[PDB]
Amino acid sequence: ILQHPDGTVLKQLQPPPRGPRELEFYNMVYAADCFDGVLLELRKYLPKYYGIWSPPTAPNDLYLKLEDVTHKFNKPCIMDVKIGQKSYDPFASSEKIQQQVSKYPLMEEIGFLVLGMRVYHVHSDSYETENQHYGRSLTKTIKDGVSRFFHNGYCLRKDAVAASIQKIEKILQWFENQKQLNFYASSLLFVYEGSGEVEVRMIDFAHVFPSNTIDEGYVYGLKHLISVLRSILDN
Ligand SMILES: c1ccc(-c2onc3ccc(-c4nnn[nH]4)cc23)cc1
Protein backbone atom coordinates (compact mmCIF):
# COMPACT_ATOMS: atom_id res chain seq x y z
CA ILE A 1 0.00 0.00 0.00
CA LEU A 2 1.60 3.22 -1.27
CA GLN A 3 -0.24 6.31 -0.01
CA HIS A 4 -0.33 8.86 -2.86
CA PRO A 5 -0.75 12.64 -2.19
CA ASP A 6 -3.67 12.82 -4.67
CA GLY A 7 -5.96 10.96 -2.22
CA THR A 8 -5.42 7.54 -3.80
CA VAL A 9 -3.51 4.46 -2.69
CA LEU A 10 -1.53 2.14 -4.97
CA LYS A 11 -1.82 -1.50 -3.90
CA GLN A 12 0.77 -3.78 -5.47
CA LEU A 13 -0.84 -6.96 -6.86
CA GLN A 14 -0.04 -9.95 -4.64
CA PRO A 15 1.70 -12.95 -6.30
CA PRO A 16 -0.57 -15.27 -8.36
CA PRO A 17 -3.19 -16.44 -8.00
CA ARG A 18 -4.17 -13.88 -5.34
CA GLY A 19 -3.18 -10.62 -7.08
CA PRO A 20 -4.81 -11.55 -10.44
CA ARG A 21 -8.03 -12.61 -8.66
CA GLU A 22 -8.25 -9.21 -6.91
CA LEU A 23 -7.74 -7.39 -10.23
CA GLU A 24 -10.49 -9.61 -11.71
CA PHE A 25 -12.81 -8.72 -8.80
CA TYR A 26 -12.45 -4.94 -9.19
CA ASN A 27 -12.86 -5.34 -12.98
CA MET A 28 -16.11 -7.33 -12.55
CA VAL A 29 -17.59 -4.85 -10.05
CA TYR A 30 -16.56 -1.59 -11.75
CA ALA A 31 -17.19 -2.81 -15.31
CA ALA A 32 -18.15 0.03 -17.67
CA ASP A 33 -21.13 -2.00 -18.95
CA CYS A 34 -22.20 -3.48 -15.58
CA PHE A 35 -25.87 -3.00 -14.67
CA ASP A 36 -26.03 -5.78 -12.06
CA GLY A 37 -28.09 -4.35 -9.17
CA VAL A 38 -26.20 -6.32 -6.50
CA LEU A 39 -22.79 -5.24 -7.84
CA LEU A 40 -24.02 -1.64 -8.22
CA GLU A 41 -24.85 -1.44 -4.49
CA LEU A 42 -21.55 -3.18 -3.64
CA ARG A 43 -19.59 -0.23 -5.12
CA LYS A 44 -20.85 1.97 -2.25
CA TYR A 45 -18.90 -0.12 0.29
CA LEU A 46 -15.67 -0.56 -1.71
CA PRO A 47 -12.87 1.95 -2.30
CA LYS A 48 -13.49 3.76 -5.60
CA TYR A 49 -11.57 1.96 -8.36
CA TYR A 50 -9.54 3.89 -10.95
CA GLY A 51 -8.34 0.89 -12.96
CA ILE A 52 -5.00 -0.91 -13.22
CA TRP A 53 -1.83 1.19 -13.00
CA SER A 54 1.80 0.34 -13.74
CA PRO A 55 4.96 2.55 -13.79
CA PRO A 56 5.57 4.05 -17.29
CA THR A 57 8.82 2.06 -17.60
CA ALA A 58 7.70 -1.13 -15.79
CA PRO A 59 4.52 -2.72 -17.30
CA ASN A 60 5.36 -5.85 -15.26
CA ASP A 61 4.79 -4.01 -11.97
CA LEU A 62 1.00 -4.14 -11.55
CA TYR A 63 -0.98 -2.01 -9.08
CA LEU A 64 -4.60 -1.26 -8.32
CA LYS A 65 -5.30 2.47 -8.05
CA LEU A 66 -7.83 2.80 -5.21
CA GLU A 67 -9.45 5.58 -3.19
CA ASP A 68 -7.57 6.42 0.00
CA VAL A 69 -10.41 5.99 2.50
CA THR A 70 -8.35 7.88 5.12
CA HIS A 71 -7.86 10.92 2.83
CA LYS A 72 -10.59 13.14 4.29
CA PHE A 73 -9.28 12.83 7.88
CA ASN A 74 -6.80 15.05 9.74
CA LYS A 75 -5.58 12.49 12.30
CA PRO A 76 -7.25 9.23 11.14
CA CYS A 77 -7.61 6.37 13.58
CA ILE A 78 -7.53 3.21 11.45
CA MET A 79 -8.42 -0.43 12.20
CA ASP A 80 -8.35 -3.38 9.77
CA VAL A 81 -10.62 -6.31 10.70
CA LYS A 82 -10.62 -9.57 8.72
CA ILE A 83 -14.18 -10.97 8.49
CA GLY A 84 -15.48 -14.55 8.33
CA GLN A 85 -15.30 -17.98 9.98
CA LYS A 86 -12.84 -19.26 7.36
CA SER A 87 -9.71 -17.45 6.12
CA TYR A 88 -9.04 -20.26 3.63
CA ASP A 89 -11.00 -20.38 0.36
CA PRO A 90 -13.09 -23.30 -1.04
CA PHE A 91 -10.19 -24.63 -3.16
CA ALA A 92 -7.42 -24.69 -0.54
CA SER A 93 -5.35 -27.85 0.05
CA SER A 94 -5.29 -29.62 3.44
CA GLU A 95 -1.86 -28.06 4.01
CA LYS A 96 -3.20 -24.60 3.11
CA ILE A 97 -6.26 -25.00 5.38
CA GLN A 98 -4.01 -25.97 8.31
CA GLN A 99 -1.80 -22.93 7.68
CA GLN A 100 -4.82 -20.59 7.76
CA VAL A 101 -6.66 -22.11 10.75
CA SER A 102 -3.44 -22.17 12.81
CA LYS A 103 -3.00 -18.40 12.37
CA TYR A 104 -6.22 -17.91 14.34
CA PRO A 105 -8.10 -21.09 15.45
CA LEU A 106 -10.76 -18.88 17.05
CA MET A 107 -11.77 -17.61 13.58
CA GLU A 108 -14.68 -20.09 13.43
CA GLU A 109 -15.66 -19.19 17.00
CA ILE A 110 -15.37 -15.39 16.75
CA GLY A 111 -15.81 -14.77 13.01
CA PHE A 112 -13.41 -11.82 12.82
CA LEU A 113 -9.74 -11.01 13.47
CA VAL A 114 -8.17 -7.59 14.11
CA LEU A 115 -5.24 -7.33 11.68
CA GLY A 116 -4.05 -4.02 13.14
CA MET A 117 -4.93 -0.53 14.33
CA ARG A 118 -3.38 2.94 14.34
CA VAL A 119 -4.83 5.12 17.13
CA TYR A 120 -4.03 8.82 17.53
CA HIS A 121 -3.74 10.01 21.14
CA VAL A 122 -4.49 13.70 21.78
CA HIS A 123 -2.94 13.26 25.22
CA SER A 124 0.57 12.76 23.83
CA ASP A 125 0.15 14.03 20.24
CA SER A 126 1.25 10.61 18.95
CA TYR A 127 0.08 7.32 17.41
CA GLU A 128 -0.40 3.92 19.05
CA THR A 129 0.18 1.01 16.63
CA GLU A 130 -0.96 -2.61 17.07
CA ASN A 131 0.15 -5.33 14.64
CA GLN A 132 -1.06 -8.78 13.50
CA HIS A 133 -0.04 -10.41 16.80
CA TYR A 134 -2.38 -8.14 18.82
CA GLY A 135 -5.65 -9.40 17.31
CA ARG A 136 -4.40 -13.00 17.08
CA SER A 137 -3.86 -12.89 20.88
CA LEU A 138 -7.50 -11.99 21.59
CA THR A 139 -9.73 -14.78 22.92
CA LYS A 140 -13.44 -14.84 23.76
CA THR A 141 -10.50 -10.11 25.88
CA ILE A 142 -12.08 -9.53 22.41
CA LYS A 143 -14.37 -6.80 23.80
CA ASP A 144 -11.42 -4.98 25.44
CA GLY A 145 -9.28 -5.71 22.37
CA VAL A 146 -11.69 -3.89 20.05
CA SER A 147 -12.39 -1.17 22.66
CA ARG A 148 -8.73 -0.08 22.51
CA PHE A 149 -9.31 1.31 18.99
CA PHE A 150 -11.89 3.78 20.34
CA HIS A 151 -9.81 5.29 23.18
CA ASN A 152 -9.28 8.84 21.89
CA GLY A 153 -9.96 12.44 22.99
CA TYR A 154 -9.79 11.75 26.75
CA CYS A 155 -12.76 9.35 26.47
CA LEU A 156 -14.24 6.23 24.93
CA ARG A 157 -15.45 7.40 21.50
CA LYS A 158 -18.97 5.91 21.68
CA ASP A 159 -19.91 8.23 18.78
CA ALA A 160 -17.41 6.40 16.55
CA VAL A 161 -18.60 3.03 17.93
CA ALA A 162 -22.26 3.84 17.18
CA ALA A 163 -21.40 5.23 13.72
CA SER A 164 -19.43 2.04 12.96
CA ILE A 165 -22.41 -0.16 13.92
CA GLN A 166 -24.79 1.79 11.67
CA LYS A 167 -22.42 1.59 8.69
CA ILE A 168 -21.68 -2.13 9.20
CA GLU A 169 -25.45 -2.69 9.29
CA LYS A 170 -25.63 -1.42 5.68
CA ILE A 171 -22.91 -3.87 4.61
CA LEU A 172 -24.74 -6.63 6.51
CA GLN A 173 -27.97 -5.74 4.65
CA TRP A 174 -26.12 -6.10 1.32
CA PHE A 175 -24.85 -9.58 2.32
CA GLU A 176 -28.38 -10.66 3.28
CA ASN A 177 -29.61 -9.59 -0.18
CA GLN A 178 -26.98 -11.37 -2.32
CA LYS A 179 -25.97 -14.97 -3.09
CA GLN A 180 -23.53 -14.36 -5.97
CA LEU A 181 -20.25 -13.85 -4.08
CA ASN A 182 -18.50 -15.39 -1.06
CA PHE A 183 -15.59 -13.51 0.54
CA TYR A 184 -12.66 -15.22 2.31
CA ALA A 185 -9.80 -13.40 4.05
CA SER A 186 -11.33 -10.00 3.18
CA SER A 187 -11.43 -7.07 5.63
CA LEU A 188 -13.36 -4.07 6.92
CA LEU A 189 -11.34 -0.86 7.20
CA PHE A 190 -12.61 1.43 9.97
CA VAL A 191 -11.58 5.09 10.06
CA TYR A 192 -12.61 7.86 12.47
CA GLU A 193 -11.25 11.34 13.23
CA GLY A 194 -8.80 11.38 16.16
CA SER A 195 -7.86 15.09 16.01
CA GLY A 196 -19.35 12.73 8.60
CA GLU A 197 -17.11 11.18 11.28
CA VAL A 198 -16.57 7.48 10.37
CA GLU A 199 -15.57 5.42 7.33
CA VAL A 200 -16.19 1.67 6.98
CA ARG A 201 -15.16 0.05 3.68
CA MET A 202 -14.66 -3.52 2.47
CA ILE A 203 -11.08 -4.21 1.25
CA ASP A 204 -8.77 -7.08 0.18
CA PHE A 205 -10.40 -9.28 -2.47
CA ALA A 206 -7.80 -11.95 -3.36
CA HIS A 207 -10.20 -14.72 -2.23
CA VAL A 208 -13.65 -13.73 -3.53
CA PHE A 209 -15.47 -16.53 -5.37
CA PRO A 210 -18.80 -16.99 -7.23
CA SER A 211 -21.43 -18.71 -5.06
CA ASN A 212 -24.98 -20.09 -4.98
CA THR A 213 -25.60 -19.31 -1.30
CA ILE A 214 -25.55 -16.68 1.45
CA ASP A 215 -22.04 -15.97 2.73
CA GLU A 216 -22.94 -17.44 6.12
CA GLY A 217 -19.44 -17.09 7.61
CA TYR A 218 -19.13 -13.41 6.64
CA VAL A 219 -22.61 -12.70 8.06
CA TYR A 220 -21.73 -14.49 11.33
CA GLY A 221 -18.63 -12.29 11.61
CA LEU A 222 -20.44 -9.02 10.83
CA LYS A 223 -23.21 -9.91 13.32
CA HIS A 224 -20.72 -10.81 16.05
CA LEU A 225 -18.59 -7.69 15.46
CA ILE A 226 -21.77 -5.56 15.75
CA SER A 227 -22.67 -7.38 18.98
CA VAL A 228 -19.22 -6.61 20.43
CA LEU A 229 -19.40 -2.94 19.36
CA ARG A 230 -22.93 -2.83 20.83
CA SER A 231 -21.60 -4.06 24.19
CA ILE A 232 -18.89 -1.36 24.15
CA LEU A 233 -21.68 1.25 24.08
CA ASP A 234 -22.61 0.05 27.61
CA ASN A 235 -19.12 0.79 29.02
C1 LIG B 1 -3.49 2.75 6.06
C2 LIG B 1 -4.15 1.54 5.84
C3 LIG B 1 -5.07 1.40 4.80
C4 LIG B 1 -5.33 2.48 3.94
C5 LIG B 1 -6.20 2.44 2.92
O1 LIG B 1 -6.92 3.54 2.57
N1 LIG B 1 -7.69 3.19 1.50
C6 LIG B 1 -7.45 1.91 1.22
C7 LIG B 1 -7.99 1.16 0.26
C8 LIG B 1 -7.63 -0.16 0.10
C9 LIG B 1 -6.68 -0.70 0.96
C10 LIG B 1 -6.34 -2.00 0.83
N2 LIG B 1 -6.87 -2.83 -0.08
N3 LIG B 1 -6.33 -4.05 0.11
N4 LIG B 1 -5.48 -3.95 1.15
N5 LIG B 1 -5.50 -2.68 1.60
C11 LIG B 1 -6.15 0.12 1.96
C12 LIG B 1 -6.54 1.42 2.08
C13 LIG B 1 -4.66 3.70 4.18
C14 LIG B 1 -3.74 3.84 5.23
From Swiss-Prot:
UniProt keyword list: Acetylation, ATP-binding, Kinase, Lipid metabolism, Magnesium, Metal-binding, Nucleotide-binding, Nucleus, Phospholipid metabolism, Phosphoprotein, Transferase
Effect on the protein upon substituting residue 14 to A: Strongly decreased enzyme activity
Outcome, altering residue 100 to A: Strongly decreased enzyme activity
GO BP annotations listed: inositol phosphate biosynthetic process; inositol phosphate metabolic process; inositol trisphosphate metabolic process; necroptotic process; phosphatidylinositol metabolic process
Consequence when changing residue 96 to A: Strongly decreased enzyme activity
Residues engaged in binding ATP: 11, 67-69, 80, 204
Effect of residue 100 to R: Decreased activity with inositol 1,4,5-trisphosphate. Increased phosphorylation of inositol 1,3,4,5-tetrakisphosphate
Effect on the protein upon substituting residue 80 to N: Loss of kinase activity and ability to execute necroptosis
Tissue-specific expression: Ubiquitous, with the highest expression in skeletal muscle, liver, placenta, lung, peripheral blood leukocytes, kidney, spleen and colon.
Cofactor(s) it depends on: Mg(2+)
Molecular function terms, GO-annotated: 1-phosphatidylinositol-4,5-bisphosphate 3-kinase activity; ATP binding; flavonoid binding; inositol tetrakisphosphate kinase activity; inositol-1,3,4,5-tetrakisphosphate 6-kinase activity; inositol-1,3,4,6-tetrakisphosphate 5-kinase activity; inositol-1,4,5,6-tetrakisphosphate 3-kinase activity; inositol-1,4,5-trisphosphate 3-kinase activity
Consequence of changing residue 18 to A: Strongly decreased enzyme activity
Enzymatic reactions: 1D-myo-inositol 1,4,5-trisphosphate + 2 ATP = 1D-myo-inositol 1,3,4,5,6-pentakisphosphate + 2 ADP + 2 H(+); 1D-myo-inositol 1,3,4,6-tetrakisphosphate + ATP = 1D-myo-inositol 1,3,4,5,6-pentakisphosphate + ADP + H(+); 1-octadecanoyl-2-(5Z,8Z,11Z,14Z)-eicosatetraenoyl-sn-glycero-3-phospho-1D-myo-inositol 4,5-bisphosphate + ATP = 1-octadecanoyl-2-(5Z,8Z,11Z,14Z-eicosatetraenoyl)-sn-glycero-3-phospho-(1D-myo-inositol 3,4,5-triphosphate) + ADP + H(+); a 1,2-diacyl-sn-glycero-3-phospho-(1D-myo-inositol-4,5-bisphosphate) + ATP = a 1,2-diacyl-sn-glycero-3-phospho-(1D-myo-inositol-3,4,5-trisphosphate) + ADP + H(+)
Family: Belongs to the inositol phosphokinase (IPK) family.
Function: Inositol phosphate kinase with a broad substrate specificity. Phosphorylates inositol 1,4,5-trisphosphate (Ins(1,4,5)P3) first to inositol 1,3,4,5-tetrakisphosphate and then to inositol 1,3,4,5,6-pentakisphosphate (Ins(1,3,4,5,6)P5). Phosphorylates inositol 1,3,4,6-tetrakisphosphate (Ins(1,3,4,6)P4). Phosphorylates inositol 1,4,5,6-tetrakisphosphate (Ins(1,4,5,6)P4). Phosphorylates glycero-3-phospho-1D-myo-inositol 4,5-bisphosphate to glycero-3-phospho-1D-myo-inositol 3,4,5-trisphosphate.
Protein's name according to its UniProt entry: Inositol polyphosphate multikinase
Organism: Homo sapiens (Human)
